[PDB]
């Protein structure tokens, strides 16, 4: 009955400090335990730590006091900082509530990703953070035409950007039928590229709207279907 959203930079330099925010919506943090869990590419889940509603904390001993978790009840935000990062810290980071319940004949217990009292799902979305020396690079956006009586399929190429992610809409969100946006590839340049394709069978216009939050850039591209 709850929403948690992770936010912060997707790229951190080696030996520097990774910081993230968990913004909680529709609860008071005075009444909720909130914790952090990460998943490295391909591998196990690892617990980072938790801040209880009473204000005390617990941390994973395996992170060697590199962790700090704080909260601001007034702003509905929980903060995480992890110092001296290496490539071992490249992972997807989740916030979640630690919700407690009575187990019949046993006592009280708690589970991460569960809201107390209502027992609804209470996981954040997850945010990938990559530890890397690479510089931020805004994408170049190119129109795609299959015109090389034809049935015409068109698109936008979002070329040579860093880091992930980017968002694509068409006609400021109005066009959705026949839209397929593909996951990105990493090219030998060391930069990402992805494509969005529109398949439609007139007065119709086609404009792709690309956003790259890491570079605070937005690009609108008109694409011509005709031949």
């Amino acid at each position: 009955q709850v929403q948690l959203q992770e936010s912060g930079p997707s790229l951190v330099k080696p030996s520097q400090t990774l910081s993230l925010t968990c913004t909680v919506s529709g609860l008071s943090l005075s009444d909720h335990n909130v914790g952090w869990i990460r998943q490295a590419p391909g591998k196990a889940l690892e617990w980072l730590g938790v801040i209880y509603k009473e204000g005390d904390k617990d941390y994973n001993p395996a992170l060697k006091s590199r962790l700090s978790i704080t909260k601001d009840n007034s702003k509905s935000q929980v903060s995480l900082s992890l110092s001296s990062v290496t490539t071992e810290d490249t992972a997807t980071y989740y916030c979640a509530t630690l919700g407690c319940y009575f187990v019949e004949g046993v006592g009280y217990d708690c589970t991460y990703g569960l809201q107390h009292t209502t027992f609804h799902d209470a996981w954040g979305q997850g945010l990938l953070v990559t530890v890397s020396s690479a510089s931020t690079t805004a994408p170049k956006v190119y129109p795609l035409s299959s015109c090389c009586s034809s049935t015409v399929t068109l698109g936008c190429l979002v070329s040579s950007y860093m880091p992930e992610p980017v968002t694509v809409t068409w006609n400021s969100g109005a066009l959705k039928s026949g839209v397929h946006t593909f996951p990105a590839v990493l090219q030998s340049s060391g930069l990402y590229s992805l494509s969005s394709m529109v398949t439609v069978p007139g007065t119709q216009t086609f404009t792709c709207n690309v956003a790259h939050p890491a570079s605070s850039t937005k690009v609108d591209k008109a694409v011509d279907p005709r031949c």
Binding site: Q1, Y94, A96, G99, Y101, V103, D109, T111, G113, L114, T118, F119, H120, D121, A122, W123, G124, Q125, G126, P183
Partner: peptide, 18 residues
């Protein structure tokens, strides 16, 4: 794969709402 986590079971046998 490529997506997030969802709680299916808590307290040994209990199901979250939904």
């Amino acid at each position: 794969p490529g997506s997030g986590l969802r709680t299916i079971i808590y307290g040994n046998t209990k199901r979250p709402s939904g």
